[PDB]
Amino acid sequence: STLKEVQDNITLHEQRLVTTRQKLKDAERAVELDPDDVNKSTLQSRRAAVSALETKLGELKRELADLIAAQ
C-alpha cells in the first residue's frame, strides 16, 4: 500500500534521474568543447532538471524512512 506507492515513485524518479543525467552529460561535453550561448543554455536547463529530480528524491526517501519507522 502507501509504502509500496512511495517506493514505486522513488523507482520512477531514480530511472528518470539516470536518463536526465545522461542528457546532462551530453550537454556538459558540448559546452566543454564549444561554450556558445546556445550550448550554455542547454546545459543550464539540463542541470536544473537533474537537481530538481534529486531534490524530489531526497524528499521521497526521507518520507519513506519515516513511514517505515512508524510501521
* 8 A C-beta contact, residue 41 and residue 5: no
Helix or strand holding residue 36 (H, E): none
* DSSP one-letter code for 60: H
Helices and strands: H and E segment counts in the chain:
2, 0
Max CA pair span of the chain: 53
Domain housing 30: 1-71
Alpha carbons 39 and 41: distance in angstroms, whole number: 5
Alpha carbons 26 and 9: distance in angstroms, whole number: 26
Residue 32 belongs to a domain with what CATH number? Answer: 1.20.58.90
The one-letter amino acid at 70: A
Which three three-digit cell numbers place residue 49? 532538471
This structure's resolution (Å) is: 1.1
Q: How far apart are the first and last CA of the chain?
A: 12
* DSSP one-letter code for 30: H
Experimental approach was X-ray
